[PDB]
Design a protein around this ligand. Structure first.
Ligand SMILES: Nc1nc2c(ncn2[C@@H]2O[C@H](COP(=O)(O)OP(=O)(O)OP(=O)(O)O)[C@@H](O)[C@H]2O)c(=O)[nH]1
Ligand SMILES: [Cl-]
Ligand SMILES: [Cl-]
Ligand SMILES: [Cl-]
Ligand SMILES: [Cl-]
Ligand SMILES: [Cl-]
Ligand SMILES: [Cl-]
Ligand SMILES: [Cl-]
Ligand SMILES: [Cl-]
Ligand SMILES: [Cl-]
Ligand SMILES: [Cl-]
Ligand SMILES: [Cl-]
Ligand SMILES: [Cl-]
Ligand SMILES: [Mg+2]
Lengths: 996, 209, 119
């Protein structure tokens, strides 16, 4: 029965609609669901708008009327201009009449806010279409009708609020530049009369709901109105006194005064400066007397979360930080304003103690502004000494770990500035907080961690002498804490924090070799502790200390027999014996950092030789057995050992880069034989067991070997300095080992890491291996395209690596694309346009960049047949494909690069930089310029794709576009204007003449 | 048991349906099947203040599948606005979703959620996310995939709707499970079903679990 | 009212025959609980943070832990009656752990629990 309303051949049963709607909003399960589908089909019926005036008159369900207005809004925003003037005036009148009727009935005004507000928005959609050109009297009548009734006046404030939002706050994306300017000038021209009304309501007062609606509209006006409406009327006084005293108006008023604080205001005017001071004084006085004193515990209040307290305290934070970041200089040089300045900062100190991360970030942004100022501005820090002392404690007690990168960065910077301003106070707070860890009063894992992060964050702020005394005191105290504590959980927590602090003070370690040696040897002891987290922090601390102090490991220290790196390597087997593989790789990576400090080639190569001793000997035995017996590789344990040897090579190559070449050279031949042997085993397994084989631990293990080999070669080549050796030694064997294996595997067995490795090869030595780049294309291009050209989802890693490879080949070795057969070149153009159509931003952006670069590559060739044949074959495919992704509303992230590509394409023709006719003969007079034909082609294409546009709209748009094809910002403006106009009927063709 | 209408809004593919399904069944849906209009699911949490039920109106982010649009927001008592921290456009659109929502629901607790924080290449940086401050929205970084902060939006809304800041999620007592006897008629049935399941790979074999 | 015999972090899946795919059901502490009245040992598993039940069933002596083709740190087994989601239902479960060591230890404890349940 419900499906009855979808039958338009018969008049609409309002009582049925009301049941469908009730079923949807109040029903459940299968019934709710079915009502949902029916209502969506009803609303989307393109004649549904005809039924609106019937539904509004004869429905008893306010939800039905809401949905009726949604239907009307689709018509008004999309197809309004098709309606005869008499019909548009009809709709306008039945909307206005519905609003006035609802407002005049006190019961309906109170209870139907949803439907009234929805009606008000519908009216604003009509005003966007009709006002003021076809409705000059709207504002005068609104002002007039406002004195007739308190309900109508209040509702008129809601209409003017929504008008302001639609014209000033949300117009940029939703209207043409010309239409937005028209409506802005129109509201500007009549604002004097709107403001008069708003000011009278605020002055005359009485009804709180009316006053609140009026201040809600004022908040919107403050985004655009001139300062004189605020500063040259009584309104500043009313906002900062009267409306701050009553809690109904306090929240909106605070928001208004925040926006008042952001007004564009003259800089050289003492009366305005005094007025700016006075509204702040008045606001803070009202808060201190009517809400809470400066001493109040806002942490406690916020936590209690009574009524609107949380929102009020957030809004207070926003007002204080906004006003002070602009105006605190007004309060700083006058003795009579000192108390106001310090009370306002004292409120911010209390707000900063609230347990609410997002509020803390807001206040921290302000504190960063302030302490940065005190660091540089002369004679200002002394004002804020007691504020800064409190703030030191707030930041230290709130310090987060360095993993939370943005928050830790902000906190560190504030604490560093504060430490510079008073090093003694910072030290005293940190030592005394440590004392309360030791006496147990504030002891907890969170509290010792927090303190350790804070102590770590100020490294480098103190003098070396002060740092020395501070660091020793802190380590002594943390060691005492460790001894004092019982059980391994507690001892691990304090040990980790000792390690953390030591790791953040390299300047101290570099001056005290004996201490550094002790730290390292202690870290080595900890690498045998199986207690959770200890081995990871020992390894993390080791590599962090090496990154900073590596030079001290590579020289012979006084009273040592050898550089300490020799001592580390000698005992490496024993040191790392209890570590997990990932921890072993970190350890070897850290040794790689040290060895790369040795700039004597013979000594560096010997250290590298010695470091790689254990994986090289494990490799040699495996290779002997692997060559002797091919079956030994199948064993699970051997695959894991081989993977971990390759991963150790990757770790050391990561930190040594170009210096790693002798080690790569030692394993290179047998590593590529292993790649081939593992590849055979994978192919064989997939034949024997099916595609499921690729999910098995055995085959994942084997593929891990291939991925780590590809990772090792890409890691070395990305950092190589001797490119001649790369081209002469590495590239030929690599290409022979990987390309044919990739091409001749089934899609599901192909490693995307091959594409990634090839990208680095073309990046670094592409210019030197033209035949290699051709071979790369021949092996990967057509088989990878066929994997990714059936849908947007399959093989996401191949998809991404594929377009990165095409991009770098197109940049570095464009001759490889000239060598393609025409069929293969056509697939290349297909592949680029395919990338355009992607919603993954990685592919789409590479897609559009390849298109740009390809155009540039063709243009470089000058007037020759390949370039001429390229334009004849592909110019219009690129223009139409780019227009497609620009206009289909499914590719908005690509807007900028779409516009840049379209501009380049249009500019080529506008400049006559294409030698041959783009049209095939007897399609136009044989004299015809490519400019005339492009104009014709685009007019035709846009007309067929958007048949609701006029010939005039299309011609005006294309005239503007071709004129603006050397001015990207203006061109983009015209494109956005077109995207607005295609969503509606009867867009003004003069909009494309817009000039700022 | 009290029940609250919750509207979930934000751009297509930000993770709204994925987040709700994770809460409903515990599953992670990898595939993108765009919501058509709205999907309504009851969702119950057990708190130290008894059970709380959210009637979750998971709305369509794609304009072409929008259905009733703001018609879904009527009588909502709370809302999540979702964006994708890997997609800048989705954050640019947050003020548009907020606008359409608060025009219908003037005074409701709202959580802004930046989803997909598990993805390494984050495009919407912490420093950029400030829209919530002046609008008094709670903000969380979430991952429907890693479950990072995945309980927080509901815990915060529950505290706001119950008016108890100390409200916690609790474990309900677990009833003794039944002893049963495998049906000898369905024994051949089960070896089949087990064969199929043993030879279908578990997803995401590289994860910590 | 229950002794905790074994606790391990695990991810639990149920097989959807229709979609022919494994769907995750929860991640959290998997507990073997011995009822102090009956001496019956059950699996009780709760999701991280929500603490909602994703597994609640007797470790029936007739159950068999099988490997999954994709994993060396998982078991699949048919469960005739699980009460996590209210009314007792039959599921094909898969439980995955942090390591092969964790999975083997689970298997060891699961067999011990099966013998306790035989009494
Ligand atoms: N990496 C990652 N992917 C996620 C996450 N959450 C969701 N996804 C994926 O992103 C897509 C989100 O799809 P949906 O949840 O349907 O998106 P939606 O916002 O509901 O979409 P509409 O219905 O179109 O509004 C799916 O492919 C999800 O698997 C996350 O936290 N991390
Ligand atoms: Cl203006
Ligand atoms: Cl200032
Ligand atoms: Cl040095
Ligand atoms: Cl040795
Ligand atoms: Cl090794
Ligand atoms: Cl070819
Ligand atoms: Cl294609
Ligand atoms: Cl088009
Ligand atoms: Cl249209
Ligand atoms: Cl539920
Ligand atoms: Cl943030
Ligand atoms: Cl906030
Ligand atoms: Mg969805």
């Amino acid at each position: 029965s419900m499906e009855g309303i979808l039958d338009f051949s018969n008049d609409l049963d309002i009582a049925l609609l009301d049941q469908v709607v009730s079923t949807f909003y109040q029903g459940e399960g299968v019934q709710q669901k079915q009502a949902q589908e029916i209502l969506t089909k009803f609303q989307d019926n393109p004649d549904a708008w005809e039924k609106v005036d019937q539904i509004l008159q004869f429905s008893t369900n306010p939800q039905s009327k809401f949905i009726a207005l949604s239907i009307l809004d689709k018509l008004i925003t999309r197809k309004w201009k098709l309606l005869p003037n008499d019909h548009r005036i009809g709709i306008r009148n039945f909307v206005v009449g519905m609003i006035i009727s609802m407002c005049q009935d006190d019961e309906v005004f109170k209870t139907q806010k949803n439907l009234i507000n929805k009606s008000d928005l519908t009216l604003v959609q009509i005003l966007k279409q009709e006002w003021p050109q076809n409705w000059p009297e709207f504002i005068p009548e609104l002002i007039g009708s406002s004195s007739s009734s308190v309900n109508v006046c209040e509702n008129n404030m809601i209409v003017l609020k929504l008008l302001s939002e639609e014209v000033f706050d949300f117009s940029a994306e939703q209207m043409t530049q010309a239409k937005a300017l028209h409506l802005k000038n129109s509201m500007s021209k009549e604002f004097e009369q709107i403001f008069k009304l708003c000011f009278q309501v605020l002055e005359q007062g009485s009804s709180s709901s009316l006053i609140v609606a009026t201040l809600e509209s004022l908040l919107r006006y403050l985004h655009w109105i001139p300062y004189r409406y605020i500063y040259e009327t009584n309104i500043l006084e009313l906002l900062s006194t009267k409306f701050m005293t009553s809690p109904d108006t306090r929240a909106i008023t605070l928001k208004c005064l925040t926006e008042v604080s952001n007004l564009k205001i003259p800089q050289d005017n003492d009366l305005i400066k005094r007025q700016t001071v006075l509204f702040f004084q008045n606001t803070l006085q009202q808060i201190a007397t009517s809400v809470m004193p400066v001493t109040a515990d806002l942490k406690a209040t916020y936590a209690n979360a009574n009524g609107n307290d949380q929102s009020f305290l957030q809004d207070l934070a926003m007002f204080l930080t906004t006003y002070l970041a602009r105006n605190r200089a007004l309060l700083e040089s006058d003795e009579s304003l000192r108390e106001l300045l310090l009370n306002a900062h004292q409120y911010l100190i209390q707000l900063s103690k609230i347990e609410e991360r997002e509020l803390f970030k807001t206040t921290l942004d302000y504190w960063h502004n302030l302490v940065a100022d005190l660091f540089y501005e002369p004679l200002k820090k002394h004002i804020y000494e007691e504020i800064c002392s409190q703030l030191r404690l707030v930041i230290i007690e709130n310090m987060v770990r360095p993993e939370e990168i943005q928050l830790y960065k902000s906190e560190r910077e504030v604490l560093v500035y504060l430490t510079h301003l008073n090093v003694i106070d910072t030290e005293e707070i940190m030592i005394s907080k440590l004392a309360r860890q030791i006496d147990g009063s504030e002891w907890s894992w969170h509290n010792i961690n927090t303190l350790s992060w804070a102590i770590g964050s100020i490294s480098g702020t103190m003098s070396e002498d002060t740092e020395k005394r501070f660091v020793v005191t802190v380590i002594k105290d943390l060691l005492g804490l460790c001894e004092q504590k019982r059980g391994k959980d507690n001892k691990a927590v304090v040990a980790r924090d000792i390690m953390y602090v030591v790791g953040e003070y390299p300047r101290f370690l570099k001056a005290h070799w004996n201490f550094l040696r002790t730290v390292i040897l202690k870290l080595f002891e900890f690498m045998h502790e199986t207690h959770e987290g200890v081995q990871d922090m020992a390894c993390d601390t080791f590599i962090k200390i090496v990154q900073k102090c590596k030079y001290h490991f590579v020289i012979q220290q006084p009273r040592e027999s050898e550089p300490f790196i020799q001592t580390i390597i000698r005992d490496i087997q024993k040191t790392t014996a209890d570590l997990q593989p990932q921890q072993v790789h970190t350890f070897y990576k850290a040794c790689g950092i040290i060895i790369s400090e040795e700039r004597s080639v013979a000594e560096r190569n010997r250290l590298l030789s010695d470091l790689m001793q254990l994986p090289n000997m494990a490799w040699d035995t495996i290779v002997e057995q692997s060559t002797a017996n091919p079956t030994l590789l199948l064993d699970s344990e051997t695959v894991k050992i081989i993977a971990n040897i390759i991963k150790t090579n990757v770790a050391v190559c990561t930190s040594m880069g170009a210096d790693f070449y002798p080690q790569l050279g030692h394993i290179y031949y047998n590593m590529l034989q292993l790649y081939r042997a593992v590849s055979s085993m994978i192919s064989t397994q997939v034949a024997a067991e099916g595609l499921i084989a690729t999910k098995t631990p055995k085959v994942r293990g084997l593929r891990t070997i291939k991925k780590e080999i590809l990772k090792l070669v890409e890691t070395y080549i990305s950092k190589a300095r001797n490119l001649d050796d790369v081209v002469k030694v590495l590239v030929e064997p690599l290409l022979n080992a990987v390309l044919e294996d990739y091409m001749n595997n089934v899609p599901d067995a192909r490693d995307a890491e091959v594409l990634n490795c090839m990208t680095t090869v073309v990046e670094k030595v592409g210019h030197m291996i033209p035949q290699g780049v051709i071979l790369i294309l021949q092996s990967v291009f057509e088989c990878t395209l066929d994997m990714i050209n059936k849908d947007f989802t399959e093989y996401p890693e191949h998809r991404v690596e594929f377009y990165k490879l095409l991009k770098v080949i197109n940049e570095k070795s464009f001759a490889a694309f000239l060598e393609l057969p025409p069929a293969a070149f056509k697939l290349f153009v297909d592949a680029i346009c395919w990338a355009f159509k992607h919603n993954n931003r990685d592919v789409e952006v590479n897609g559009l960049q390849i298109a740009l670069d390809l155009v540039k590559n063709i243009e470089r060739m000058g007037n020759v047949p390949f370039a001429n044949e390229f334009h004849k074959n592909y110019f219009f495919i690129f223009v139409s494909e780019t227009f497609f992704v620009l206009t289909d509303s499914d590719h908005k992230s690509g807007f900028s690069k779409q516009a840049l590509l379209l501009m380049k394409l249009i500019s080529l023709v506008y400049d006559n930089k294409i030698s041959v006719p783009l049209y095939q003969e007897a399609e136009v007079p044989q004299g015809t310029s490519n400019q005339v034909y492009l104009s014709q082609y685009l007019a035709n294409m846009l007309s067929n794709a958007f048949p609701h546009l006029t010939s005039e709209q299309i011609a005006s748009f294309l005239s503007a576009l071709t004129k603006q094809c050397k001015d990207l910002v203006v061109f983009k403006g015209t494109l956005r204007d077109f995207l607005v106009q295609i969503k509606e009927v009867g867009g003004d063709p003069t909009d494309y003449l817009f000039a700022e | 048991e009290v029940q609250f209408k919750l509207v979930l809004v934000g751009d297509g593919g930000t993770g709204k349906t994925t987040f709700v399904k994770r809460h409903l069944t515990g599953e992670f849906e990898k595939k993108y099947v765009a919501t058509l209009g709205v999907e309504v699911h009851p969702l119950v949490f057990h708190t130290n203040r008894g059970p709380i039920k959210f009637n979750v109106w998971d709305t369509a982010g794609l304009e072409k599948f929008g259905g009733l649009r703001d018609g879904y927001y009527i009588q909502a008592q709370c809302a999540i606005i979702m964006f994708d921290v890997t997609s800048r456009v989705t954050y640019k659109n947050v003020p548009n979703w907020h606008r359409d929502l608060v025009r219908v629901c003037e005074n409701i607790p709202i959580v802004l959620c930046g989803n997909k924080v598990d993805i390494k290449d984050r495009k919407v940086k912490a420093k950029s996310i400030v829209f919530h401050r002046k609008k008094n929205l709670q903000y969380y970084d979430i991952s429907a995939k890693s479950n990072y902060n995945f309980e927080k939006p509901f815990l915060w809304l529950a505290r706001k709707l119950i008016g108890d800041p100390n409200l916690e999620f609790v474990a309900m007592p677990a009833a003794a499970p039944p002893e049963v006897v495998m049906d000898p008629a369905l024994a051949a049935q089960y070896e089949h079903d087990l064969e199929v399941a043993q030879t279908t790979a578990l997803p995401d074999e590289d994860d910590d679990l | 009212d229950e002794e905790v015999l074994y606790k391990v972090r695990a991810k639990l899946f149920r097989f959807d025959a229709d979609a022919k795919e494994w769907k995750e059901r929860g991640t959290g502490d998997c507990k073997f609980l011995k009822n102090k009245k009956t001496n019956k040992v059950r699996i009780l598993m709760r999701r991280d943070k929500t603490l909602k039940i994703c597994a609640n069933h007797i470790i029936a002596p007739e159950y068999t832990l099988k490997p999954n083709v994709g994993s060396d740190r998982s078991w699949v087994y048919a469960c005739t009656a699980d009460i996590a989601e209210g009314e007792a239902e039959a599921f094909t479960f898969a439980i995955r752990f942090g390591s092969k060591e964790n999975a083997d230890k689970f298997k060891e404890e699961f067999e011990k629990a099966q013998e306790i349940n035989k009494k």
